[PDB]
Amino acid sequence: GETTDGVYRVMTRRLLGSTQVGVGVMQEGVFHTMWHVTKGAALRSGEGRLDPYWGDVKQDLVSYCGPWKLDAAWDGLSEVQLLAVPPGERAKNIQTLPGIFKTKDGDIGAVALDYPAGTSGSPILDKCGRVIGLYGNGVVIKNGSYVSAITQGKRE
Amino acid sequence: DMYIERAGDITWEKDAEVTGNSPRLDVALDESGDFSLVE
Ligand SMILES: CN(C)C(=O)N1CCNCC1
């Protein structure tokens, strides 16, 4: 099926009508999304099938057709773009300066942007167009505002 | 069965909408992949 690089919607027919449950990135023949979007299940691309290859619930990431290919990282200084793909709506670039998730195991960039649940897996980009992580695993803070980690995997 | 549909090219767009703040938050990540706020 479709193996062209780019951002994709992840859809299901299990619920009422056609529902968008998330988003992902096709790069170098590998499809990358968040684990909570597919739960590790196989995907369809037209008449073709994508099988999971690697996955980890704690990182909340999964890759299909090959190993994780996304290795760019947020530089800790510059603004980034969330390439948001909301349900039933056009892809839209949103520029923002990331905040920080401070953890006992190190610091992670975070984006304070709020989109419907089905937007999980939308890529976050650097000034070169490189994917530095995926949007959709985060927290709700004091004023009811959602903050997502910039979640990135490791390229072996 | 779940399926994928192309939605766009991955590129940086000049003069995109600029919004969102930059909070610094102390968080914990559990074995289930759920983040939670630590205070
Ligand atoms: C994972 N994710 C993007 C969500 O579940 N959200 C954020 C808070 N508003 C509702 C939708």
Ligand SMILES: CN(C)C(=O)N1CCNCC1
């Ligand atoms: C439309 N949008 C991105 C939001 O829901 N925002 C507003 C400004 N930053 C926090 C959340």
